[PDB]
Symmetry: D2
Subunit: 410 residues, 4 copies
């Protein structure tokens, strides 16, 4: 009977043959991009076919079988509406509306404590989606690079848990939110930083990754790791931001010395070098599009949805999503978990890394911040997104009132 | 067509007629109980047919159809493995192993009268599948397990915005477990005593306390599918003679004007002690938890009991605030919304899957049942129920929602 | 040569007899009052002889001798300039200028009257001075806290009292907690500490006897000047005491009281003690007893033990003025206690006691005018705890003449 | 009539001449030392007269007058028992009893062993009377005993209102004894490390730290009447290799902009380490304390060293913040301003009476010299020196200001 065969009659509504562009247009409406790394054999074979047969340009039955047979499983799920969001085109129109609504919210202040971020216009606003099946959508300024800043904190925590395990990592860092009075304290009662998402905790996490090698290799180790999480889309580095972050980081130096004195680091830690490494990790650059793929790896249990590659252990991803839930949005963490109920991490450059587990990852970026440090338009977008769709952690998948569920339905 | 006939042969081995016991046995392995309120017409119609004779009795396609047609949608789901846990018989063996492993955990102190060897676990899935092991029909008081239930009621009747004018929505953090109010002069959240006291003051304002208790009781009846709910006047007397800290809380809340206008603080405290003395079993409480797991619909009656807004809010504050000073550790390791109480109950919700009640009176130093806490950890070590487990890639955890 | 004889010649100076009014005028200029209880025998015999010969009114040497022989020691200290403040008339001029200076600070808010303002002085030797509204009765309120702590330490000792209450301030940021880390109230000057102290006094008698016992105690500290009671204030404090009932229950729960304590009854007694009434004049004598190592300066009676007075002055220093205690100790350096009626009980150790009263309070709860007066007094005189008695710059020292 | 001859007859009784040694013995029993800087002219004049012959050796009314004329006012005061403690020989006997009693308190840890542990106590009254017992000439580092001294310097040179733009005036409370800043983003007071780090940054701004150090040394020489002051490079290196907490404090002060404009934070810390390593003995530190006891006038030289505002502010903050977490208990029971240091010293001021230094390296769990704290308790148990003792009615305490 044959899968390439059946798939074949699906797209050939009636005629004996399929226009190439008709196949492509139907393929894009799944949400996949033609550049998807799991589709390269079929796409090369299609480009090749346009060369060796300029006459159609069209695909007989064993011809189309020749192109798609190597990527047939993925192509079948895509076309039999088996993806996690089957009517992706309708969903993206909602995302676009949410985008436009948030664009009207013009408040907030751009971070200005170093000139590498006071240059960023307050009117850039970008949102990117990548589902657990690699379906993609973007609107606004989603290819402009910006620094992860604290959005890097769960990514490096995930790396440490992946290489070292939960039990070892949390000998060094706690696993719960401070409470809003303990905002300003470096250590909890057990002389550990409260959790990996506060600066002091991220500084200790930074100190456990790849112990014993030097900083250059430590950085390459982590960059290699972010590449895989992003399915090899753009991961960069801002020396300009790193230089300025290192010359105005008095409070992180205050933290570093206190942790050294309280013996918070592993035996043999060069605290000043760990601080240097920490500033580097804050200066790693992404776009909305590449960061959204990183979020989707977290949404997808540690597998990069656009490569199929296993990147992080389930243990690492579960721990990470737990702490983003409860500690990821600074003093707004409790409010955010209550009203949004999604694991999220914000950073001072205006990014909000966001995870809808089992569904999708997003990156929202708009430089202006509210008093707590969260992007105004990202915060507004996140509330709206959950008002509209039953993605809240404690929404019910069967009884959800007037909320829309994009995992379903005609 | 043939909706009820297709059921007849699925159960009858291509054969003339079904013995009744064989249909009942087939129905128990779905996990449903013959007493399920949604199966009443069918069971009534069997009792009439059993009265015709004293024989098999056995049912022909025509007689079978006459019993089951009223409840056919539910019964087919059950028998074509459509329920949220299709292989429920395998699942309960695991629950049984979990139960016996926690039974060996002998530590803890009983608060102070009950026996330290009582230990029960009850499950009710979002589809009404039931299982119990241990001391699951012994009544005991909810105590603080009631706090999510009455917060649910208050949000259900007044909305989230009104309720959180009077109570916060975050954990305090390990040091202010002793403070009564947060910086905005509100109790930190409704899972602490100060906050449950304020929440108690919002329910059915204006009406008197006797009717207020009636309303809550009726509301809990809906929540339990009308299974066992009661009241311990002995606990109520004990709780009130020793409620010094609760009175300290009440007067401080009064002075800081934390109550709605027209509140009688001393009466609210009395009402609060009443709500803490409400009695349940493991079985009836597990149905209440399943209502919360099922979006506000009681899984064994089909009735809508709470708004989805109420359930969501309640499940959120149970995640972060429901296990006292262990809330943060429990969230991190178990990832399940839960509420413990000093009688030794742990009300436990696995959203979209099942509700549970665990009960063993011996508490650890934080006030949580030792065996319930052990059981909860093991449950999520075993099955991919942690709130941030992935539903597609979960390593070697078992997933009871799948077959094979 | 007899002592009443030489004291006679110093006052007689010229002629052979002293008009009585000349003696009395010279006596008041020491700052003593004619009504002083240590002067009663001399004053009674002076009144007697103004009857016993309605002439003159003469007063020769032997007549002087039989009038003043009973009180000759104190009269000699007074006339030989032996009192702690010898030039008392010059000092009272200074008090008056400070009074008038504080009088023009009209800010603050009463406790829910803005023109009542009085200041009374009583030295360790019984010299009195008043200016302004100093015979108007008003409730001690929290000014009673050091007085009943002193009573409890006097009857019970320091060890016993302080199993139940702490000894230090603890934090402008733990100023909202009821208990310190050892589950005791922080010190006797906060409400929860003052509530526990109340529960220690005269245990095992009913509340009416406890009250009479403390009022009798306050009578002695005040040299039997006005001590009274305000049922109006008592009923008010008792209806609006939700905060203190919240403290009482937390204290019960954490077992802060002595065994056998009726907490609700203790709160009633506590409300009673807050409602006790004084004037500036009588309260100043109370302060002066504290300044005089526990002896009432206008009666010579021993009222409190050195231990009780030392402990009380120490805690007034650091916990006396609500959240202004740290700043007051630094800038004023005098033991003091304020209350919500506008009083400020003030002790200059070894010199004098004072009571200042002006109802309007600043946002920390202290009488605006009292606070301004207390700063000005220390700016002018070398009375700060850590002023030096020998090298003190431009400050004045009223313990001296030339 | 002549003051010098009036003194002659008193020393001599009714004899011809005063043997020199009998005048020396008579002078030493006032408490004054023959090396007292204010008695130098008189001692130079006995030195001259003692070189004019072999073993002569006595002074006539005319010779005596020749020696004592330049210092007659101060010798008169001494010999007519006008000093603040008139019967000084009796008082030092009491200091010796107190010393021996504290000597038996062997507990504590220093901040392997070869020699006994050291214990010394020096007294210097406001009139310059001196007494010493134990290891009083062994140099040791001030460490945090220097904190009141450098705060006084800064208030002396800059005033109260400038200094307290940068540092607070109150103790933090036992439960904020771990924070660097109070709610106004300033260190709590000058006696905590964070506060002393800022006080250090105020002294002699606009010269380099070698000149700043010189200035403080010159100032400390004035305070000690030019007795021993020095510097331990050993302590200075060890204090700076192990100053991670002080660097954490320094960076937090910088981030929060707590220093005066133009401050080099890393250099101030190095200056701060130097000041902690300055060396005194018991004897010379007691003179420093005595200067604080005497309104800012050095008692053995008569020089005005600090303004009264500096000294008053310094004594006030020693009262409440001087003995770490024991400050509250020490203020209540001892009632004297004091400052302890981790080398074992306790700078002790009895206002208007005397200054003392007690030194014994073993510290209690709070960081205070065990023996020094024992002595301080005994001293006020014995004498009516407590800030709130009464000078007239004082139970059966002793008052060494009085005759007999
Ligand atoms: O900013 C301020 C105003 C202020 C004042 C007081 C209260 C306050 O209230 C508020 F906290 F709610 F804001 C604010 N202060 C401030 C803020 C920050 C700092 C740098 C902090 C560095 C020193 C420390 N870091 N972590 C620590 N952890 C513990 O001690 C853990 C613990 C907890 C309980 C029991 C035992 N151990 S210590 N130093 N000082
Ligand atoms: O609990 C303690 C010592 C303590 C420590 C650590 C360990 C410890 O050990 C031990 F308890 F086990 F002994 C004891 N003290 C205590 C504890 C509780 C109480 C009743 C308190 C009722 C009064 C208040 N309720 N909420 C408030 N919040 C606000 O006002 C705003 C603010 C400012 C600061 C902090 C948070 N909020 S005030 N009053 N005092």
């Amino acid at each position: 009977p044959s899968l390439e065969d059946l798939l074949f009659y699906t797209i050939a509504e009636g005629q004996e043959k399929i226009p190439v562009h008709k196949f492509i247009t139907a393929l894009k409406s799944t949400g996949l991009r033609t550049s998807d790394p799991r589709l390269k054999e079929c796409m090369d074979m299609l480009r090749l076919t346009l060369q060796t047969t300029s006459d159609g340009v069209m695909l007989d039955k064993d011809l189309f079988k020749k192109c798609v047979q190597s990527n047939i499983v993925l192509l079948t799920q895509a076309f039999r509406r088996k993806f996690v969001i089957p009517d992706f085109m309708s969903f993206t129109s909602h995302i676009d509306e949410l985008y436009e609504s948030a664009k009207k919210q013009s408040g907030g202040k751009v971070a200005d404590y170093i000139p590498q971020l006071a240059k960023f216009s307050p009117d850039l606003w970008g949102v990117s989606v990548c589902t657990v099946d690699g379906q993609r959508h973007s609107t606004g300024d989603t290819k402009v690079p910006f620094c992860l800043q604290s959005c890097v904190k769960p990514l490096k925590y995930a790396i440490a848990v992946n290489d070292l395990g939960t039990e070892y990592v949390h000998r060094y860092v706690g696993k719960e939110p401070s409470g809003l009075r303990f905002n300003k304290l470096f250590l909890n009662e057990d002389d550990k930083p409260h959790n990996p998402m506060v600066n002091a905790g991220a500084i200790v996490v930074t100190s456990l990754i790849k112990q014993g090698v030097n900083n250059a290799e430590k950085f390459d180790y982590v960059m290699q790791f972010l590449n895989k999480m992003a399915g090899n889309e753009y991961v960069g580095f801002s020396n300009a931001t790193f230089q300025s972050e290192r010359e105005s980081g008095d409070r992180n130096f205050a933290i570093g010395y206190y942790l050294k004195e309280k013996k918070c680091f592993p035996e043999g830690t060069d605290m000043v070098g760990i601080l240097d490494f920490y500033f580097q990790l804050c200066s790693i650059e992404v776009t909305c599009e590449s960061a959204s793929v990183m979020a989707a790896t977290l949404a997808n249990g540690g597998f990069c949805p656009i490569t199929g590659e296993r990147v992080l252990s389930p243990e690492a991803v579960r721990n990470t999503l737990s702490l983003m839930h409860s500690c990821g949005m600074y003093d707004f963490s409790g409010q955010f978990a209550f009203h949004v109920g999604l694991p999220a991490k914000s950073g001072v450059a205006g990014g909000i890394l966001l995870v809808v587990p089992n569904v999708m990852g997003m990156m929202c970026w708009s430089p202006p911040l509210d008093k707590m440090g969260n992007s105004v338009k990202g915060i507004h977008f996140c509330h709206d997104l959950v008002s509209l769709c039953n993605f809240h952690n404690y929404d019910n998948l069967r009884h959800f009132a007037k909320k829309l569920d994009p995992r379903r339905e005609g």
